[PDB]
Amino acid sequence: RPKLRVVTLVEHPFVFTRESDEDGQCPAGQLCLDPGTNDSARLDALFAALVNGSVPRTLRRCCYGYCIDLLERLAEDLAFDFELYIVGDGKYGALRDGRWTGLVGDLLAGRAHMAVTSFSINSARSQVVDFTSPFFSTSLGIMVRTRGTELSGIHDPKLHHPSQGFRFGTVWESSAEAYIKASFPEMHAHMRRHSAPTTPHGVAMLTSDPPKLNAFIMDKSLLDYEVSIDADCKLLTVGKPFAIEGYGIGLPQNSPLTSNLSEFISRYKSSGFIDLLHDKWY
C-alpha cells in the first residue's frame, strides 16, 4: 500500500488547519507538517523525525476542508496512504529567476507525489507538470468594499487608467497574477506594488484603516468565501467573470497516478459527490 507525500497550501474553504492535540496528533483532520522550507533534505528529515525523532507541535497542524475530504476519498478508492506538508513559501507557483516557486516548484523538485489544494490549471504550468481532470471550476473575480467602487469587470477603464490614489492588487505568484501579467502587462505594472502574499492578506488591505486597496483580484471561489464570512457583510464581488480555469490535482510529469486520479474525479463529478463537498464547505 503505497504512501504518497502530498503538498498543500492553506486556502479557505479548500484547506483549513487547526492546532494538533497535546500529543501532536489529530483526532479530527489529517496531520500536516508546517516545515517552512523548500530544502529537500530538511523535508525528508522532518518526515523521518515523525517516526524516529521529535517534531514539535509548532510544526504540526491538523488539516481539513473540501480538498482534504477529496483526498481522503481518493485514498480510499485508490488504496493509498498519505502524509501531508504545507508548501514552505505559501505560494501556488510562478516562474521566477528561471525556477518555479510554490507547489509547482516542489512537484518539479521531487518533494511531493502530488499537490492538493485550490490549484489552478493553466497553460504555463501544464507545460511542466501534469494535472488531473479538474474537480472544480472558477472565474477570477474582483472584490471591493460595499458602497464605493463599482467595476464592470477586467476591462473597466478605472483599472486601465487608474485615478490618483486608486489602488488594486492580486496575490503574488498566483494564477490570477499570471493571467494579468500575460494579458494586461500595463495593468500588472500598477498592481505588482500593491499585491499580497495570500488571499486573507489581500482582503485585509480592503478593510484596513485607511484601506490600502480599492479592489482585489483573485479566484472568485476564494473571494466568495471571504465575502460570506466578513463580520459586517461589507465586502462584495463586482463585474463580469473573466479568466475561467479549473482546479486540478498537480503531479510531476508522466506520473503513473494521474490517470487513475482523473477517472475517480470524473466519477465524483457525475455522481454528485463534488457538489456535496461544495454544499458542505460553502
Directed axis angle between helix 220-229 and helix 199-207, to 10°?
50
CATH of the domain at 266: 3.40.190.10
Residue range(s) defining the domain that contains residue 16: 1-137+249-282
- The answer for residues whose C-beta is within 8 angstroms of residue 31's C-beta and 6 or more apart is 20, 24, 25, 60, 61, 62, 63, 83, 84
- 132 and 64 in a common domain: yes
- For residue 57, the 8-state DSSP code is G
Identity at 217, one-letter amino acid code: I
Q: How far apart are CA 87 and CA 157, in angstroms?
A: 37
Number of domains composing the chain: 2
Residue by residue, what is the 3-state secondary structure of 155-216?
CCHHHHCCCCCCCEECECCCHHHHHHHHHCHHHHHHHCCCCECCHHHHHHHHHCCCCCCCEE
- 200 and 82 in a common domain: no
- 261 and 149 in a common domain: no
Q: Say what the resolution is, in angstroms.
A: 1.6
C-alpha cell at 3: 504512501
40 is in an annotated binding site: no
88 to each of 7, 91, 118, 129, how far by Cα in Å?
A: 10, 8, 16, 19
Residue 192 half-sphere exposure toward CB, CA atoms < 13 A: 12
Q: How far apart are CA 200 and CA 220, in angstroms?
A: 13
C-alpha cell at 36: 517552512
125 is in an annotated binding site: yes
- The answer for residues whose C-beta is within 8 angstroms of residue 21's C-beta and 6 or more apart is 27, 62
Residue 133 CB neighbour total at 10 angstroms: 17
C-alpha cell at 92: 501556488
118 is in an annotated binding site: yes
49 is in an annotated binding site: no
- 211 and 113 in a common domain: no
- 154 and 179 in a common domain: yes
Q: How was this structure determined?
A: X-ray
- 6 and 110 in a common domain: yes
- The answer for residues whose C-beta is within 8 angstroms of residue 125's C-beta and 6 or more apart is 93, 104, 131, 175, 250
- The answer for residues whose C-beta is within 8 angstroms of residue 239's C-beta and 6 or more apart is 141, 142, 151, 152, 153, 154, 156
Q: Are 169 and 217 in contact, with CB atoms under 8 Å apart?
A: yes
Q: Which of 75, 61, 91, 85 is nearest to 8 (CA)?
A: 85
- 83 and 210 in a common domain: no
147 is in an annotated binding site: no
Q: Are 171 and 197 in contact, with CB atoms under 8 Å apart?
A: yes
34 is in an annotated binding site: no
Q: How far apart are CA 251 and CA 53, in angstroms?
A: 29
Q: What contacts 24+ positions apart, CB below 8 Å, involve 23-26?
A: 24/55, 24/56, 24/57, 24/60, 26/62, 26/63
Identity at 35, one-letter amino acid code: P
C-alpha cell at 193: 506594488
Extended beta strands in the chain, E state: 3-8, 16-19, 30-33, 60-64, 81-86, 95-96, 99-100, 114-115, 129-131, 136-145, 168-169, 215-219, 235-247, 250-252
